[PDB]
Write a protein that binds this ligand. Structure first.
Ligand SMILES: [Cl-]
Ligand SMILES: [Cl-]
Ligand SMILES: [Cl-]
Ligand SMILES: [Mn+2]
Ligand SMILES: [Mn+2]
Ligand SMILES: [Mn+2]
Ligand code: NA
Ligand code: NA
Length: 326
DNA sequence: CCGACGGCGCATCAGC
DNA sequence: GCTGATGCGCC
DNA sequence: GTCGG
């Protein structure tokens, strides 16, 4: 981690702008620079050297020089010492509490974990569960556990209907040795871009995972996207495994490639890639890649039979999932 | 100097 | 009930 | 906050 000190600083600045400033573009700018710097293969000696990188500008170069000189940034030193900012940043670590709700809670005098615990009745469902598992959700998932979880989901899904295909994406598919959570893309030939011949396709699967006590809680759910909690089973006399986040996204089967591109990420890889498509006259979503017409509007879906096809359209050499960890 | 910055699912709420 | 705005979430 | 035009 050649420039861990700098990228940590930028990440902290990004979080501040998002959770406290509510300046979402500053948030995206900081994350973009942190990312471009993380992959830069030299130990950075000056801001001017970082500025040569796209995404790193004058302001970030200045902060980089301060950080290399002193080992800190005064701006962040002060943000840390600010009670309202610290509280707001903390509350936003609970799933379901964002910048708006965090500020509101701080206003009402709710600003710690203990305050939250005694004011459970002030939380919506999602927040209640986010709080319930606050500690567990901060732990990472070793790839070995991800492999155990994969086997359970794929095997249980098989038991509902052999025609389902479940694919674990997210950092797992990019080959990470540890994951923040588990993301599962689901397809079934009853659900395509042209028709929904079978209702309840996602629910059925959620039910089955709930039946075997894998899924333990639900944050939100609809016809195509489930967001909840899950837990691996423990052996006799062994400590319980931590509760984990799970996301399941049902995608039309004929649009699997755009879907697996989306759900593989990273999030920054996706932003970068979709921005580039626009520059080249295309717009990409989890469903389709389409042409931009002369006016502002998108054309019919272009044919796609591979992830690589999407890269071709926008004139990018193909990138393996393992190299999409931006 | 400026305008754009990726795209979209689910929960909640205000107005009708 | 509907619809659109907003929040929070996903990668 | 950074970028292209
Ligand atoms: Cl902003
Ligand atoms: Cl610092
Ligand atoms: Cl589409
Ligand atoms: Mn994930
Ligand atoms: Mn996830
Ligand atoms: Mn994520
Ligand atoms: Na630059
Ligand atoms: Na949160």
């Amino acid at each position: 981690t050649l420039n861990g000190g700098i990228t940590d600083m930028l990440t902290e600045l990004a979080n501040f702008e998002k959770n406290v400033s509510q300046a979402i573009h500053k948030y995206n700018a900081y994350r973009k620079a942190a990312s471009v710097i993380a992959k830069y293969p030299h130990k950075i000696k000056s801001g001017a050297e970082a500025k040569k990188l796209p995404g790193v500008g004058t302001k970030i170069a200045e902060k980089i020089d301060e950080f290399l000189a002193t080992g800190k940034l005064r701006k962040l030193e002060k943000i840390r010492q600010d009670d309202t900012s610290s509280s707001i940043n903390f509350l936003t670590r609970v799933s379901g509490i964002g910048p708006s709700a965090a500020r509101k809670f701080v206003d009402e005098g709710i600003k710690t974990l203990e305050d939250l615990r005694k004011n459970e009745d002030k939380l919506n469902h999602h927040q209640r569960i986010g709080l319930k598992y606050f500690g567990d959700f901060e732990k990472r998932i070793p790839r070995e556990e991800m492999l155990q979880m994969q086997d359970i989901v794929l095997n249980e899904v098989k038991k509902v209907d052999s025609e389902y295909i479940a694919t674990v994406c997210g950092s797992f598919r990019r080959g990470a040795e540890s994951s923040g959570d588990m993301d599962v893309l689901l397809t079934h030939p009853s659900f395509t871009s042209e028709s929904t011949k079978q209702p309840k396709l996602l629910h059925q699967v959620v039910e089955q995972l709930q039946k075997v006590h894998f899924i333990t809680d639900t944050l939100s759910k609809g016809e195509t996207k489930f967001m909840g909690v899950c837990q691996l089973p423990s052996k006799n006399d062994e400590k319980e495994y931590p509760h984990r986040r799970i996301d399941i996204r049902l995608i039309p089967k004929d649009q699997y490639y755009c879907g697996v591109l989306y759900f593989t990420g990273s999030d920054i890889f996706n932003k970068n890639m979709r921005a580039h498509a626009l520059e080249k006259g295309f717009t990409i979503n989890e469903y389709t890649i389409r042409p931009l017409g002369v006016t502002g509007v998108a054309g019919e879906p272009l044919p796609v039979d591979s992830e690589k096809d999407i890269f071709d359209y926008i004139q990018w050499k193909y990138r393996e999932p393992k190299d999409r960890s931006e």
